[PDB]
Design a protein around this ligand. Structure first.
Ligand SMILES: [Mg+2]
Ligand SMILES: [Mg+2]
Ligand SMILES: [Mg+2]
Ligand SMILES: [Mg+2]
Ligand SMILES: [Mg+2]
Ligand SMILES: [Mg+2]
Ligand SMILES: [Mg+2]
Ligand SMILES: [Mg+2]
Ligand SMILES: [Mg+2]
Ligand SMILES: [Mg+2]
Ligand SMILES: [Mg+2]
Ligand SMILES: [Mg+2]
Ligand SMILES: [Mg+2]
Ligand SMILES: [Mg+2]
Ligand SMILES: [Mg+2]
Ligand SMILES: [Mg+2]
Ligand SMILES: [Mg+2]
Ligand SMILES: [Mg+2]
Ligand SMILES: [Mg+2]
Ligand SMILES: [Mg+2]
Ligand SMILES: [Mg+2]
Ligand SMILES: [Mg+2]
Ligand SMILES: [Mg+2]
Ligand SMILES: [Mg+2]
Ligand SMILES: [Mg+2]
Ligand SMILES: [Mg+2]
Ligand SMILES: [Mg+2]
Ligand SMILES: [Mg+2]
Ligand SMILES: [Mg+2]
Ligand SMILES: [Mg+2]
Ligand SMILES: [Mg+2]
Ligand SMILES: [Mg+2]
Ligand SMILES: [Mg+2]
Lengths: 185, 175, 68, 157, 175
RNA sequence: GUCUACGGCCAUACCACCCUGAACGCGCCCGAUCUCGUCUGAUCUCGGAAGCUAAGCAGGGUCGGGCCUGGUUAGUACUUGGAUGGGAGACCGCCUGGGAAUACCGGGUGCUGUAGGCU
RNA sequence: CCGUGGAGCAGAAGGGCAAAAGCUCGCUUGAUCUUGAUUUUCAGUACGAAUACAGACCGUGAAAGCGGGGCCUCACGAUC
RNA sequence: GUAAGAAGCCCGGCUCGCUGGCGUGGAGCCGGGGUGGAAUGCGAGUGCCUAGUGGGCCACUUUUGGUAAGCAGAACUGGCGCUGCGGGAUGAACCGAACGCCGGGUUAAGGCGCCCGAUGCCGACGCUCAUCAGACCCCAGAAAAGGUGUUGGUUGAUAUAGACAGCAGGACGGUGGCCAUGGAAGUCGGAAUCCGCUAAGGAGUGUGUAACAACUCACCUGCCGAAUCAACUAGCCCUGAAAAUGGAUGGCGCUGGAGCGUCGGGCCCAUACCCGGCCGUCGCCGGCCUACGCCGCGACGAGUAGGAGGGCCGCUGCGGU
C-alpha cells in the first residue's frame, strides 16, 4: 500500500503558551479566519500559534522603511509580535501601527509623533477582514543561532562560526585555518 | 498452452504492417487448435514467428474465426502429425484416431500423448490433421472397427453407484 | 575471527527511502570558476552601464511609447 | 583492494575505435561552444592533456565556463546517496554537441511558426505531441488470391 | 459489407482497457511497484480504466505478472460505474448517489450527469483523464467461480495476462 | 566535362597491373653568381623555359584485392520478467518482449565549401 | 625496393603516437614566482597526483603557437 | 546520462577596461507585445536537534576459490532478523498473504477415502502389477548400463513368382587349391575368393579330431498356409540398489485407484477481498457549546532496538481547596 511516515502534519494547531490574553486572541481570530474567509485572518491566526523564535521582534527603523514605500500612506502596519524601539533613528512619521506588546520606550516615541496605536482586539473591531493593512515581520533568520548553522565548519566554504569556548588567539586557529599549519580549510 | 477441456478449431489470417519498402503482405493463414481465441492468436503468433520473420508488434491479425465441423454426425478417421518433444530429444510422430469432430480428434490426441508419453501441452506441435479413408488406416486399434456387423457384449460392467445405496443387503450381479 | 568484508546490499532501499531527487536548480546559479578576465569585464560593464543607460534608454523608451 | 586509480579499467573506453587512429580531425576544433549549451562528454585517447575522469564518460551536461583550449561543464554525477552538480574543466577534444537540444529547438521553431501561421486562418492546429495511438479500423485486400496456408516443418537433425 | 467481396475486415484496436490487480503487496520489485502505484492499483483486487497508448501498453507489459487487463464491455462499464462508483470531490471518497456530486466537481467540462460520465469513459476523447482521475479505484470483491492458476499467465492456462474479450466474464463474478 | 591554390567528410575516394590526356595549370626538366646546406646543388634554397606528357597527376578497365551497403545465415545463437514446468542432475521447453555475427550471394566505388584559366 | 606501426617512447602492464609523442641537430631552464576554483579515494575532509585559467618575468620559432617537468594511468608524509 | 518551455523564443536600445579590419564577436542591463507544448500518478520545499545501529543470514538468476559442502567471498531484487496468519504432516528463509475487536459472502496457495472441512461427481481418456511399486519446487534420496514385461513411434528389408516359424530332403566337382610344417583335408593363421552341371551349396557360420572322418550352418527344395523379420527411439515397471535401537508417501491404508500423465463441473477456508457495527490516528473541517468542549465525512491500524504524545493509572511529602 502506502507508507505512513509523512501522513501526520507536524504543524501545530494550538498555542503551547498558557497566556489567557493570547488564548482569547486565538479564540477570536479563529472565529474570524473561519467565518470572514479572509486569508489575512488565516495568516494572522497562524502567526499567533508560533513560538518565541518564530515571532522575531521587529525594530522601529525597519518598520519605518517598510512604511515609507509607495502605497503605504494610510495603511495600518500589523506586526504579530513585539515591536521594539530603535535608537539609531531620530525622527519618526505618524506611524499608525497595531502590534502585540509594544515596548515602553517605543510607546512614547510613537505617541509623540501624533500617530495612535491599537491592539489586536481593536484591530478586529475596526477592520475584521483586514482591509488597508500591511503585515510585517521581523528578521526570522537574524537570530544568532542561525549563524552557527550550515553544512560543516570544515568544508573549504564554511563561513559557519564554529563553537568556541573563548574567542581570541590560540583558539581554533592553527591546524585547518591557515596554510602554514597543516591545510587551509 | 493448457488445452483445457475441449479444443476448438480457429482459422487465423495475419500479415505484417504495411512498410514503405513493400505493401500488401502475402497474408499468411493458419489453422490452430486452441480452447479460446486468445490462446489461438497467441499460438498463431508463435508459429508464424517460428516460421517467418514476423512478430506481434511488427505484424497484425486480420481475422480469427471458429471453424465448425462439416459433418458432426458422421464417424470419421483422422491422421494426426506430431512434432513433440521428449525428455531426451524431439521426435515426429503419426497417429490415427476415430471421432466425429476434428477438435474431438485433437483432444483425443492431446490426452493420449500426455498419457502414454508424459508429454505436456507446452512441447506438442500439431503439424497436420486430415481425414483419411478406412483403406489408408495403418493403426490396428482403429482398423479393428472397420467391420460391418460388429458385435460385442459389455462384460463385467461396473456398479457406478457404490454410495447411493451405501448400506444394503444386496450383492451386485454385474451382468 | 573472519568477518564479512564489504557488500552493498540493502543500500538502494536506504537511498530511495529519503529520495535521490535532483539538486535544486535555480536561476543565477553561481559565478565561481568563471574566467577572471571575463568576470572583471562583466563587473566593469555592469558598473559602467548606468552612466549611459538612464539617458539614451529613457529617450528610446519615450520614442517607442510615442510610436505605440 | 581494487586498486583505485585515475585511469583504472578504461582499456576499451579510452581507446580509439578501429581504423580511426591518427591525428584528430580538424572539424571538432572549429565547433563553437557558448555558455548554456547542452553538450556530451566522450573520452578520447588521442590527446591526454585535458581528458575527463572515467566516471563522466558518456555524460551530458551544460556549459558554464569557456576558456582558450577547454570548456567548463556542469555535470550531474550520482554519488551513492545523492546527485552532485560538479564543475569540470575539459578540453574540446572530448566534447561534442547534443542533438537532443537541436531537435527540441527545431520542434519549438516549427510550433511557433505553425501557430503564428494558423492564427489568421482560425484553425486550431494540434501541435502538441502524443503517444502512438492504436490504429483505426482498416480494410485489407486479397484481390482474389487465397491466403497461403502455413504448416510447421517436421523436425530434422 | 466486407465479407460479401470475400475480403476480411479488421476493427480498430480498443482505446480503453480495464486493469485489475492480481498479485499481493509484499514481494514485488520496485520497477513494477512504481508502475502499480502510478496505475492507482495499491491494494489487491481493484481495477481502473486506462487509455491505451504506446506508453500505457508498455507500462502494462512491465507489470504483466501482477495485473489482469482486458477490453471492457459497455455493460461492464455500466455496472462498474453504477454499483462500485465512487468519486473524490476532495481528498475523501464520496459515494456517487446524486448527480450534483458529479456536476459540482466535474461539471466544468460538460460531464454533469452519470450518463455523461459513462459516455466519456466508454468513448474516450479529449476529457477522459479528468473523468478517470475523478473516479476512485474500484474496490472489487473476490471472484465467484474461483481464479485458476493465479500465478500463471492467461495464455498458459492461468489468469494474470491479457483477457481482451474474456475479462467481462470475470468482471461479472468480481462485481 | 575538367584542373590549380586552400579545405570538410577520411578507403564508396587505399593497393597491383593495363589504356587515354586536346587548350591552361601541376610537374618532369636546364643551370650554382648572388640567399641557403649537405660527402654529393640528390634533398631545401635565389636564375630560367631548350624538350616532354616518359613519370607524378587526372579519367577508364580488371567475372581484381580491400571498403560501404543490402539479402542469406535467422526469429537462429542470446536475453528482460513468470510459473507448485520437465529432468536425479547437467540442462531443456513454454508464456510475455527485444534480437547478433562468420561462411554464401548481389550492387557501388568519391560527394562537396571559397578564389582563379580554358575549350 | 617492400615495409599502418609488426620498432622505439628510462623502467610491470594497458592506452596513445609516423613530415609524430620515435632518432638526430641548434638555443634553453616554464623542473622559476603569485592568489583562487576544479578533478581524483571522498565524509565530497586532508595529503599525494592532475586539469583549465588569471596576474609579472623569461625560453623557443620567422610566425601562428608550446612550455609553469617527464605522452597518460603510481613513484610518496599531519601536530610539535 | 540529457531534453520534452514562460528560468523559452522573436524585436529594439544602451554598457564593457573582454576580443577585435569592420557598430566584429560575446557577455550584462533596460523597454512593449504574444503560456494550450508526451502519457500516467502525486501536494511540495526547507531548517535544527537526535536515539539505536556500526557480528547478519537465506532465496530465483549472474558469478570467484574449492572435488564438494547446511563451506568461504561478490552484483540486482525479495524475505527472515523487525512478522504474526492459511497450505508444505513437522519447520527462518518455500507458496499465498501481510495483523485493531466482530457478523455475512467470496477467494489466493493448497486440498476433497478416514484422522480432518470438502468429490457420497451413476466424472472423461490412456499408462501401470513391484517377492524393495508409486504418490507434488526448496524437501530429505541416486547414476552409467540392461529387459523376448507391456505400451506408442521412426527408418528399413521380405511375402500368393506361396515367405517368416515348424516337420522332412539335398548341401556336390576342379580342390587333401596357393605362403607354412609335428600336424591345418572347408574349421589354430597372412593375403585372398574364382570357375562348370545344377534347383542349391558359400575355396565355407559353428561343434568336434593331433589331422581324416562325423554333427551342423549359409543356400535350395517338399508339406502347411498368410503376414512376418531386424535395428533404433521413449512413458510405466524391473535388475543395477549394502548399515548398523523398531519406523516412516505424516499414519491407517490404497491396485475398475486413495498411483502416474492430460483435463471438466462442483465443493472446502486465511487476520486476504467485498458489505455492515464498534474503538483509535490522520486529513478535511462544521457551529458564538468545559472552545483544552460539542459534532460530520473519508482513508488507514502489525512491529524488536529506538523516538515522541496522553493517562480521571499508582506510591510518598508540601502550598491551597
Ligand atoms: Mg508502521
Ligand atoms: Mg519525520
Ligand atoms: Mg563488519
Ligand atoms: Mg461458492
Ligand atoms: Mg654558406
Ligand atoms: Mg656556397
Ligand atoms: Mg638540380
Ligand atoms: Mg606524366
Ligand atoms: Mg603514359
Ligand atoms: Mg571486387
Ligand atoms: Mg527465465
Ligand atoms: Mg608500455
Ligand atoms: Mg600499442
Ligand atoms: Mg601566463
Ligand atoms: Mg562463516
Ligand atoms: Mg555465503
Ligand atoms: Mg539482533
Ligand atoms: Mg521491515
Ligand atoms: Mg514474513
Ligand atoms: Mg503453517
Ligand atoms: Mg514467486
Ligand atoms: Mg509470496
Ligand atoms: Mg470472515
Ligand atoms: Mg486451488
Ligand atoms: Mg470429512
Ligand atoms: Mg526402483
Ligand atoms: Mg514434507
Ligand atoms: Mg535434513
Ligand atoms: Mg523400454
Ligand atoms: Mg507402509
Ligand atoms: Mg486492513
Ligand atoms: Mg503499530
Ligand atoms: Mg489518587
Amino acid at each position: 500500500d502506502i507508507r505512513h511516515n509523512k501522513d501526520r502534519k507536524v504543524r501545530r494547531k494550538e498555542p503551547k503558551s498558557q497566556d489567557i490574553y493570547l488564548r482569547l486572541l486565538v479564540k477570536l481570530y479563529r472565529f474570524l479566519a473561519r467565518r470572514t474567509n479572509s486569508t489575512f485572518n488565516q495568516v494572522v491566526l497562524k502567526r499567533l500559534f508560533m513560538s518565541r523564535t518564530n515571532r522575531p521582534p521587529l525594530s522601529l527603523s525597519r518598520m519605518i522603511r517598510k512604511m515609507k514605500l509607495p502605497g503605504r500612506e494610510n495603511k495600518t502596519a500589523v506586526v504579530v509580535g513585539t515591536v521594539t524601539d530603535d535608537v539609531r533613528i531620530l525622527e519618526v512619521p505618524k506611524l499608525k501601527v497595531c502590534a502585540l506588546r509594544v515596548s515602553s520606550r517605543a510607546r512614547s516615541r510613537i505617541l509623540k509623533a501624533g500617530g495612535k496605536i491599537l491592539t489586536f482586539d481593536q484591530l478586529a473591531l475596526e477592520s475584521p477582514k483586514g482591509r488597508g493593512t500591511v503585515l510585517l515581520s521581523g528578521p526570522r533568520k537574524g537570530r544568532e543561532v542561525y549563524r552557527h548553522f550550515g553544512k560543516a565548519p570544515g568544508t573549504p566554504h564554511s563561513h559557519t562560526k564554529p563553537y568556541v569556548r573563548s574567542k581570541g588567539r590560540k583558539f581554533e586557529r592553527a591546524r585547518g585555518r591557515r596554510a602554514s599549519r597543516g591545510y587551509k580549510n | 498452452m493448457k488445452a483445457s477441456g475441449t479444443l476448438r478449431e480457429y482459422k487465423v489470417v495475419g500479415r505484417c504492417l504495411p512498410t514503405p519498402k513493400c505493401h500488401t503482405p502475402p497474408l499468411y493463414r493458419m489453422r490452430i487448435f486452441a480452447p479460446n481465441h486468445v490462446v489461438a492468436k497467441s499460438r498463431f503468433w508463435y508459429f508464424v514467428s517460428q516460421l517467418k520473420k514476423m512478430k506481434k508488434s511488427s505484424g497484425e491479425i486480420v481475422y480469427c474465426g471458429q471453424v465448425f465441423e462439416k459433418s458432426p454426425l458422421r464417424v470419421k478417421n483422422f491422421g494426426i502429425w506430431l512434432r513433440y518433444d521428449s525428455r531426451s530429444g524431439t521426435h515426429n510422430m503419426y497417429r490415427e484416431y476415430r471421432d466425429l469432430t476434428t477438435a474431438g480428434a485433437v483432444t483425443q490426441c492431446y490426452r493420449d500423448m500426455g498419457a502414454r508419453h508424459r508429454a505436456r501441452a507446452h512441447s506438442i506441435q500439431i503439424m497436420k490433421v486430415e481425414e483419411i479413408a478406412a483403406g489408408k488406416c495403418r493403426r490396428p486399434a482403429v482398423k479393428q472397427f472397420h467391420d460391418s456387423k460388429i458385435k460385442f457384449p459389455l462384460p463385467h460392467r461396473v456398479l457406478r453407484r457404490q454410495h447411493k445405496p451405501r448400506f444394503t443387503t444386496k450383492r451386485p450381479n454385474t451382468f | 575471527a573472519k568477518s564479512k568484508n564489504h557488500t552493498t546490499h540493502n543500500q538502494s532501499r536506504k537511498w530511495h527511502r529519503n529520495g535521490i531527487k535532483k539538486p535544486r536548480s535555480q536561476r543565477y546559479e553561481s559565478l565561481k570558476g568563471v574566467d577572471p578576465k571575463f568576470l572583471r569585464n562583466m563587473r566593469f560593464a555592469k558598473k559602467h552601464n548606468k552612466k549611459g543607460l538612464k539617458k539614451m534608454q529613457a529617450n528610446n523608451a519615450k520614442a517607442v511609447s510615442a510610436r505605440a | 583492494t581494487n586498486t583505485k586509480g585515475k585511469r583504472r579499467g578504461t582499456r576499451y573506453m579510452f581507446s580509439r575505435p578501429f581504423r580511426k587512429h591518427g591525428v584528430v580531425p580538424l572539424a571538432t576544433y572549429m565547433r563553437i561552444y557558448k555558455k548554456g549549451d547542452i553538450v556530451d562528454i566522450k573520452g578520447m585517447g588521442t590527446v591526454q592533456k585535458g581528458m575527463p575522469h572515467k566516471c563522466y564518460h558518456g555524460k551530458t551536461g551544460r556549459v558554464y565556463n569557456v576558456t582558450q583550449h577547454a570548456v567548463g561543464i556542469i555535470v550531474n554525477k550520482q554519488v551513492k546517496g545523492k546527485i552532485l552538480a560538479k564543475r569540470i574543466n575539459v578540453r574540446i577534444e572530448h566534447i561534442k554537441h547534443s542533438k537532443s537540444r537541436d531537435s527540441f529547438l527545431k520542434r519549438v521553431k516549427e510550433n511557433d511558426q505553425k501557430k503564428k501561421e494558423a492564427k489568421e486562418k482560425g484553425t486550431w492546429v494540434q501541435l502538441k505531441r502524443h503517444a502512438a495511438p492504436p490504429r483505426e479500423a482498416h480494410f485489407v485486400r486479397t484481390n482474389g488470391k487465397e491466403p497461403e496456408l502455413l504448416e510447421p516443418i517436421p523436425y530434422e537433425f | 459489407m466486407a465479407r460479401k467481396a470475400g475480403n476480411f475486415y479488421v476493427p480498430a484496436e480498443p482505446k480503453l482497457a480495464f486493469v485489475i490487480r492480481i498479485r499481493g503487496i509484499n514481494g514485488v520489485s520496485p520497477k513494477v511497484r512504481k508502475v502499480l502505484q502510478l496505475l492507482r492499483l495499491r491494494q489487491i483486487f481493484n481495477g481502473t480504466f486506462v487509455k491505451l497508448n504506446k506508453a500505457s501498453i508498455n507500462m502494462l507489459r512491465i507489470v504483466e505478472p501482477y495485473i489482469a487487463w482486458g477490453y471492457p464491455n459497455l455493460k461492464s462499464v455500466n455496472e462498474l460505474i453504477y454499483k462500485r462508483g465512487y468519486g473524490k470531490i476532495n481528498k475523501k471518497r464520496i459515494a456517487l448517489t446524486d448527480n450534483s456530486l458529479i456536476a459540482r466537481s466535474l461539471g466544468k467540462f460538460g460531464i454533469i450527469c452519470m450518463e455523461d460520465l459513462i459516455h466519456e469513459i466508454y468513448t474516450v476523447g479529449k476529457r477522459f483523464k479528468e473523468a478517470n482521475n475523478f473516479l476512485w479505484p474500484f474496490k472489487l470483491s473476490s471472484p465467484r467461480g474461483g481464479m485458476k492458476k493465479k500465478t500463471t499467465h492467461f495464455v498458459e492456462g492461468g489468469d494474470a495476462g491479457n483477457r481482451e474479450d474474456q475479462i467481462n466474464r470475470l468482471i461479472r463474478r468480481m462485481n
